[PDB]
Write a protein that binds this ligand. Structure first.
Ligand code: HEM
Ligand code: HEM
Ligand code: HEM
Ligand SMILES: [Ca+2]
Ligand SMILES: [Ca+2]
Ligand SMILES: [Ca+2]
Ligand SMILES: [Ca+2]
Ligand SMILES: [Ca+2]
Ligand SMILES: [Ca+2]
Ligand SMILES: [Ca+2]
Lengths: 677, 678, 318
């Protein structure tokens, strides 16, 4: 409804051309009933021309994504730290649109690739659109925007054959990573569970760069943006993510869409670290360096307000595909820093919309329009929608009484550059030596994961680097990993038949920081929307009765229940043929269905062994699993699952089963099922 | 104008903002120190300059030079008896219009008063969809098949090695094409007449050119020609006037239209048709599918359908005039195409060319292109998509959107439908109908139907144009074609270029004439409102200014645009001699108090030597009503070598008597006895 | 001939599609001799699509202009003041392309409007393309690039009716000039004969901005570019310019084209003023200010080499 003024209703009426002439569109005009098609058929040509021209260029990066409408609510009057109008009163509401994405894949690539993820937020503020174009990882691969095409060429498919679409699993990517050691920190994040988040709702957003908050009095503070998920942090496991990339390439957009439709619209606390201008070089690194975090121990998070996504788009193309974010969409109360990565982005996002939109009036697209008046002397250009009344669009003028008026620090609530900002020195294409430690923070991150988490990251690196054909690249990779951790280099090297180089302890240390572990972030604060697959059978009325009883008690607590059986009927959502363990956060077998789990079981209605495969996959990927009804050992023995296993449930009582199982869904993953080196 | 009103942006108050509503400045770049380099992070600089860098769109492939205005069409009757068309279905029914007038060959910025064919494109924003009649001021076209359009247009546009010259009809390639493609002769004769240099957009007619069909709700059809007949009357420039006006005021026609509308003198046309039976396609001595032919009015009279009035200027020229995208494909139920091969191919071109101009497929969403009725269709996405479509099942046939939108056809939904009587029979051919082969009779009919002096103006336009052709061989080929229309024309043209005309070839010669194609013959203007009177005065004689004031009052009440001219501006003086020229006026009056300025000793640092007399003598030589108000009128006329007995020369002591006579002169408009004949 | 590798010859042969299929292009394919045109007529659609898409956007400024090929010849080894390879040896030749232009008018506006004029030179150097994008007047209207759209909106036609095409003869232009006094120096040049030059060949070219010459040792000097006409300076008179705008809108492009075809290819001495970094504020104004000239009495011209235009284009558009 925030874009209701642009909506077109086709629930009634006769087909028209784009100029409102009623027409047909089902049969071409022909010279006789078996004749050739006539050039004078305007109905044909106008419809096919539109179809022919439907597609626009995909985004150069973050081509794969999904968006939703929502509201931002301020917790306070933040005048004391920023002039930003959207933050100036307790409870002040501002409409938002968010797009989540992967980075490397083209617009049809699977959601559950291993990748960095985007988290872009537009605030339609009463002083203009403000965009925070962030990622789910707080540090970037590179220290200077000029290097972005080198990064993205190296991670994107090899340009002779456009193979492979596995961003982190080919020679060219590891060549870049190993020759550009700045990459180590973001690389360690991408090789962790942060590279395969369970959903958009179960990851954070980060501005990455230091920005400024600027008060009306002109004073400034340095800030980092942190959008902290109220759903909690969760990952897939790789073995799961690969299958899910085939069974459901749309998994993350469907999870978000379903959460909003079910009234479970995801929430983030929008937070900042605030530090003084004097602390730019005080934390043992440069706040202008986007490869570095400020440990929460040095600067705590201040909660500014609530971000809630609660409305799906009406038309995906018009809203999600066409949304054009820019870090240059800035408001009074915010300013840039001399982060050489941020500095260059400001150019890129204004320029790239010419490519996507095919013309300069992209801010006039409904999704890009602000919610306040526009007063400027911008004119003409392809696709001009506005009819400007002012016939003297120049400053300075008298013929339009000197309107529009210049807005600045002192008049018209103008944007203004933080007036304490200076530059001094040579005009240089030189890197600050303050940027030169590429390895300490990667080690900080690694140090801050749990032992099983550390194993998962080593395993992601073993997987990816084992696919690199070049022996010289694999050696260069072990040289860089070794500068972060000798142990990581030895464990990765073991997988690929190379020796790790000798320990180089220059950057080694045992410092740790809170808030970067997924496994370590404890049970989820809510299980609403989590997916329970109930494996039943049509062959036993009592199996369906057990399933209906389990459904009622699970749905009461807001879980999404799928009853699976051989065929569809009342109370069965999916067939075994379409069901998979990647479809569920937990799997329950009703003991009336135990016959389906025998090695002997066979049906033309589903692939050999499908019922037991769903159970075994779910167990092996660490999910809560169990048998409800009391007769558990036929199913558990066929699955090779121990009855006494953590996150393995066997109860006769539906009530006791669900109370135990719901604890399992909160735990989310049972990490004792994964081997350690 | 719902879509146009909704998109209007008022900047009469407020602080400068970005396109996303963030208040900003735009006067100083952000720099690393007061004498420092400009910063990349200056988003205010880049958004403003990016917009500026992208302001321009491709000009139209043809008709690039033009001007537009809003108005209203009012039907005179319920025309159900001849057409299903909803805009014509009731007495007094009003439909908003937008019209764009144009030249053909010139680029943007080329002068209005080039010798050229002119566009007259009319959009009817009807209650059953937008209906465009994309016409010209000349009722016949150069060529008989749309596939030839790039050949014609390459030949008339500047030579592509050096892009010289801008003069469409005055270079080798144009005459090469005309002489090798004899279909061109009829349109060529029109463009070489006064129709090539109209006095204004308001003083020319509009023509559909092609035969179209009127289709009734019973499926029956008739063949029609569109004629928009000026209520201002037909009038031309003279060539030497046009050439000077091209330099003094390249915006003459757009300014004339703008000024007429602002003054409450919005131009009008009777929208008319010739209506003939399908059985008459080949009855009139030529093929109605041939766009090089008119139906003589003597064979098929004009029926007045309604009133076209232009009465509102655009708010933003670029957004409305430059972006308006006309299409003969914009047709409504009750109208149908014919198998005219020129029309047939147009239908493809205008849909395709808007992709070039707009840079994307959503050009019908621009406010000027939008309809005034709801749009229901399954067209989706594309660059610049401005709609948010609620229907998530945009396919036919569907159940998931309850089968909407519904198909519209002859039976239901007031669907467009092809005239059900239309058939095709025969081989699939790239062959020209032999019924199209007479390229010379109608050019001769047109030539025959002009007055003797009008024939001289046409001979003289060809003498001018053909004399600039460098190729002797192209000039000979031209005489060969002209000779097939009229031996006399070929003899008279040949004299100017030092060649002999070929021997008479009487195959296509005849003495038939037709009413309604002559300008010189069309009689006095039915109104003199908007016509321009230059009063030549002096600041050096209070009596000269009083005379000019008394004339101004007396002429302005009759709706004439009066310019008092003197050495310097003051109260009552609109213009200096320095900026004034005879091309700025329809009539020129000298007040006898100004007599002293019309001598040969003359001279002022405030205007070129001889300017005041040059304005009067140019006015006389170009056929305009000219006169002296005073009583020493005797004298000044002698200075100018202008005879007092002269038709359209005035000489009256009384202001009241001077004006009465002078105003008859303005209606006569041109005094053609001032032009030498062969 | 410097672009000979890209030339297409149609002095012989049979008509083909863009993919080399021999075709015809004079009659549409119809369902019978008096029939409607067929959609399957690919000869028609490929030809008319090309025609329909011939036009590109005109330049936002300097839309009206004309170009020619030529040669630049260095008079010396300029190592002493610049590392620039095209200046590194006596007699070193570099191909050039030059375009001359007005500023305000659209691409079919008369050459002889009163206006500033463009003089844009490309040196196709052995160390890359070097462009000097200059005007025939050495000073600009405005002191900051962010003001360009204000200047150009004010001098271009009024945007309600696109009237008038006379850059310097309407309210908005004079409103801008009177509110933005920086415009006075360029305005005086545009109101002199410099606003209506006799030809592109009878005007000079100016870089306008102070640039730097940088030696291979890293030392720098401040320079102004001055292209000095070997044909001499000449103007029209205004009344003449106005008539010529109607009688021959192509007058300057024709003058240039004819001079080249007659073997009178126009020449300029490419010159610089060279001053020290320390003199940025020494001449009574700031060298960073593009509304100011360095008087020749303060800094004489140095001749660097010869610019000669001697070859017309083959295809104007391309
Ligand atoms: C901190 C580093 C970065 C972050 C967090 C980031 C984030 C993002 C995100 C989230 C998107 C997708 C926005 C959407 O969903 O529509 C995006 C797109 C894009 N980014 Fe960045 N980015 C970063 C660095 C860069 C750099 C250094 C460049 C270029 C120099 C760049 C150029 C682009 C381009 C061209 C697009 C496509 C934008 C569009 O089509 O609208 N990014 N980025
Ligand atoms: C009876 C013959 C014709 C008439 C009366 C005619 C009339 C016109 C008019 C008045 C315009 C200007 C519309 C405006 O003001 O925006 C125009 C534009 C155009 N015409 Fe035609 N025309 C004719 C034949 C053709 C043919 C045969 C072709 C191509 C095969 C053609 C292609 C075009 C194109 C490409 C444009 C530019 C359209 C645009 O950019 O909107 N015309 N024509
Ligand atoms: C000393 C000041 C300037 C001079 C001498 C100058 C000169 C020129 C010339 C000669 C051209 C035409 C080049 C050609 O023949 O193709 C041109 C085009 C252009 N100028 Fe400038 N100019 C100046 C300042 C500016 C400024 C301040 C801006 C914008 C911030 C600007 C933007 C442009 C644009 C957009 C074009 C069209 C370029 C193209 O389409 O290729 N100019 N200028
Ligand atoms: Ca590779
Ligand atoms: Ca994990
Ligand atoms: Ca494009
Ligand atoms: Ca020629
Ligand atoms: Ca039909
Ligand atoms: Ca003005
Ligand atoms: Ca002079």
């Amino acid at each position: 409804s925030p874009l209701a003024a642009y909506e077109v209703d086709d629930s009634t009426g006769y087909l028209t051309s784009d100029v409102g002439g009623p027409i047909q569109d089902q049969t071409s005009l022909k010279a006789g009933i078996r004749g050739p098609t006539l050039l004078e058929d305007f109905m044909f040509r106008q419809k096919i021309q539109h179809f022919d021209h439907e597609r626009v260029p995909e985004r150069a990066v973050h081509a794969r994504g999904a968006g939703a409408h929502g509201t931002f609510t301020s917790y306070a009057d933040w005048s004391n730290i920023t002039a930003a109008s959207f933050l100036n009163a307790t409870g002040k509401q501002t409409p938002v649109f968010v797009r989540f994405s992967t980075v490397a894949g083209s617009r049809g690539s699977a959601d559950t690739a291993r990748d960095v993820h985007g988290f872009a937020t537009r605030f339609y503020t009463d002083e203009g659109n403000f965009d925070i174009v962030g990622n789910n990882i707080p540090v970037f691969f590179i220290q200077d925007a000029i290097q972005f095409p080198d990064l993205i060429h190296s991670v994107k498919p090899r340009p002779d054959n456009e193979i492979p679409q596995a961003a982190t699993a080919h020679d060219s990517a590891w060549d870049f990573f190993s020759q550009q050691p700045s990459t180590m920190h973001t690389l360690f994040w991408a090789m962790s569970g942060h590279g395969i988040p369970r959903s958009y709702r179960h990851m954070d957003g980060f501005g990455v760069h230091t920005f400024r908050f600027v008060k009306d009095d002109g004073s400034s503070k340095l800030i980092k943006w942190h959008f902290k998920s109220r759903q909690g942090k969760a990952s897939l496991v790789w073995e799961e993510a690969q299958v899910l990339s085939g069974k459901n390439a749309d998994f993350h957009r469907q999870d978000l869409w379903d959460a909003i439709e079910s009234g479970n619209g995801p929430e983030w606390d929008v937070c900042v670290q605030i530090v003084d201008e004097s602390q730019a070089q005080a934390f043992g690194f440069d706040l202008l360096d986007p490869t570095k975090i400020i440990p929460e121990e040095y600067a705590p998070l201040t909660k500014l307000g609530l971000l809630k996504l609660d409305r799906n788009p009406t038309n995906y193309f018009a809203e999600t595909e066409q949304v054009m974010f820019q870090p240059g969409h800035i408001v009074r109360g915010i300013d840039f820093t001399e982060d050489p990565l941020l500095q260059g982005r400001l150019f890129s996002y204004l320029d790239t919309q010419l490519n996507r939109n095919g013309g300069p009036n992209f801010e006039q697209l409904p999704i890009n329009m602000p919610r306040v008046p526009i007063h400027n002397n911008n004119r003409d250009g392809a696709g001009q929608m506005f009819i400007h009344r002012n016939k003297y669009p120049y400053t300075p003028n008298t013929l339009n009484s000197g309107y529009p008026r210049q807005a600045n620090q002192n008049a018209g609530r103008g944007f203004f550059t933080a007036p304490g900002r200076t530059a001094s020195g040579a005009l240089v294409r030189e890197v600050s030596p303050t940027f030169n430690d590429h390895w300490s923070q990667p080690r900080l991150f690694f140090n801050s994961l749990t032992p099983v988490e550390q194993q998962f990251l080593v395993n992601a690196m073993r997987f990816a680097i084992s696919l690199v054909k070049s022996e010289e690249v694999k050696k260069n990779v072990l040289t860089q990993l070794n500068r972060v951790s000798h142990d990581v280099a030895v464990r990765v090297a073991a997988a690929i038949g190379l020796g790790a180089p000798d320990a180089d302890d220059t950057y080694y240390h045992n410092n740790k920081t809170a808030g970067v572990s997924i496994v370590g972030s404890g049970p989820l604060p809510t299980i609403k929307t989590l997916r329970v697959g109930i494996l039943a059978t049509t062959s036993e009325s009592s199996a369906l009765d057990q399933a209906a009883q389990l459904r009622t008690r699970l749905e009461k607590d807001g879980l999404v229940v799928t009853v699976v059986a051989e065929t569809l009927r009342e109370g069965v959502d999916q067939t075994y043929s379409t069901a998979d363990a990647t479809g569920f956060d937990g799997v329950v077998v009703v003991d009336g269905a135990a016959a389906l789990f025998a090695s002997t079981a066979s049906s033309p209605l589903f692939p050999t062994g499908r019922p037991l495969q769903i159970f075994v996959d779910a167990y092996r990927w660490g999910k809560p699993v169990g048998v409800c009804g009391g007769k558990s050992s036929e199913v558990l023995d066929a699955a090779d699952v121990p009855e006494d296993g953590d996150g393995v449930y066997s109860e006769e009582s539906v009530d006791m089963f669900v109370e135990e199982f719901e604890k399992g869904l909160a735990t989310f993953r049972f990490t004792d099922r994964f081997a350690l080196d």
